[PDB]
């Protein structure tokens, strides 16, 4: 995903 | 294999090592006093205890922030240019860019104190975004930072001066894709030689993954307190983790390199242009 | 130069063209019965009217979603899967397909109708997004589509199972990136012969600006009610204008094609199976 | 800009 995530 | 940090500078002295790509977070950061808005002890910490945040990440959470500004705008005014100053491992990155080691340097930190320590916006990818511009929520207008930078200092909501929306500051929000600078790593990566990663806990993506896309050849140095994400559970055989400070970590490092005395004159002059 | 609608039949019919790149919008979609929302006469228009929407365009803002995301889920119901079926245009290019011309088919619309049609997702690019997935607005889980279809049809609000967050359907609001498939275009369009452009006005960004991104000797077809965008300001040599009735262009194209009778064969089974 | 933006 694009997308800023915590892991 | 195992490698040392000793072995890792005369890499580079020996010029073995030529195009360094680096990573940092906020563990380089903390030494200029910026404040971790998620710890007690700090004024922005307790400036943001009036608004009893669910949770620290609400603050950079779309959802959040529409449904109240204010937090958010507490710590912009905080982090705005000109609070604070880079330091010994900002001016470190500045270095090396002066010798001509510098491919690309990775950030996700949104202090600006990259670009105010003198290292070239090209040779910089804020992942994370910037205090330096601001996009209209409604219209998408973009604005210099400068513009709402009044309204900031006063704790006005910056609105749109055409269509009065909530202006926001070019900051990545959780679940937003990272700039589109960010994709220089598809080309940045393969053509490192040497991969250095100081003060981050590589807690969050996609930029964590980026540690992944160096050579396996080619050396990763880490410097930070811990052992951390892709480098604790993927190890590779040139890794090399200089665990402790991240000041004192660059500090050895420095004068593993010879540039000591370098470093401390680029500082003195440095600083005092602020 | 002009070249005519004959000419482009002839050039696919001799084999001149065998990579064609579609790009589509709003008007191949409209003979489906899919309502205009921001146009007096429907039921969806009417139903939205309790919302006084300040202006259309809302309905896409982040900022006024969160304030009440409402009248989104509205348009969300009337135009979730199983509702409309497609129409003589997405046959047409679902044939165009199935005769192996279609390099890529890149929509503007949310209706679905292009994959209904039988169209395989990997020629497709849903430029605006897709009511096959959703994504928590505030923990970023992915969730199907069918996953809160019963939510969206009893006129709840989705919300998380996990956090409680709202759960967005993953249509393209105003101000974010395309999907990254969208990125597939660097590579399709310099590889296009031959360009089609279907019942769009061609008003959006960044998808309006790929009408450019052909090579200069490839032919623009548009089908559409007028000349518009990039079409109509950056004129080419090699630019056909079937201006009219969308549906009735199609009709007349696919005729010259010499495919008539199998269309309507395709027509009749296909909407069977529906 | 990577945005979707009216023209
Ligand atoms: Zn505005
Ligand atoms: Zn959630």
Redesign the pocket.
């Not at chain 2, 209209?136 to 207008?141: D, I, N, P």
């Not at chain 2, 609105?159 to 009065?164: A, E, I, K, S």
């Given at each position: 995903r694009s997308g800023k995530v915590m892991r | 294999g195992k490698l040392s940090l000793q072995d890792v500078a005369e890499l580079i002295r020996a010029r073995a090592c030529q195009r360094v790509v680096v990573m940092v977070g906020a563990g380089i950061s903390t030494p200029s006093g910026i404040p971790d808005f998620r710890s007690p002890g700090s004024g922005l910490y307790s400036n943001l205890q009036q608004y009893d945040l669910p949770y620290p990440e609400a603050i950079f959470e779309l959802p959040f922030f529409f449904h109240n500004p204010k937090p958010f705008f507490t710590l912009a005014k905080e982090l705005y240019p000109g609070n604070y100053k880079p330091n010994v491992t900002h001016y470190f990155l500045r270095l090396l860019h002066d010798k001509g080691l510098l491919l690309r340097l990775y950030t996700q930190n949104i202090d600006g104190l990259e670009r105010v320590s003198g290292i070239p916006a090209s040779k910089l990818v804020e992942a994370h975004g910037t205090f330096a511009s601001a996009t209209?929520?409604?219209?998408?207008?973009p604005f210099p930072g400068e513009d709402i930078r009044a309204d900031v200092m006063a704790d006005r909501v910056p609105?749109?001066?055409?269509?009065?929306?909530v202006?926001k500051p070019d900051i990545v929000f959780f679940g937003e894709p990272l700039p589109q600078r960010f994709l220089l790593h598809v080309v940045d990566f393969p053509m490192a030689d040497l991969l250095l990663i100081l003060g981050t806990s590589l807690e969050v993506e996609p930029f964590a993954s980026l540690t992944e896309a160096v050579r396996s050849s080619v050396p990763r140095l880490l410097i930070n307190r811990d052992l951390v994400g892709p480098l604790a559970w993927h190890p590779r055989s040139r890794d090399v983790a200089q665990l402790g400070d991240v000041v004192h970590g660059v500090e050895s490092l420095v004068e593993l390199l010879g540039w000591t005395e370098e470093m401390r004159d680029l500082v003195q002059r440095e600083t005092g242009k602020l």
């Open positions: - | 209209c929520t409604v219209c998408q207008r609105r749109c001066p055409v269509c009065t929306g202006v």
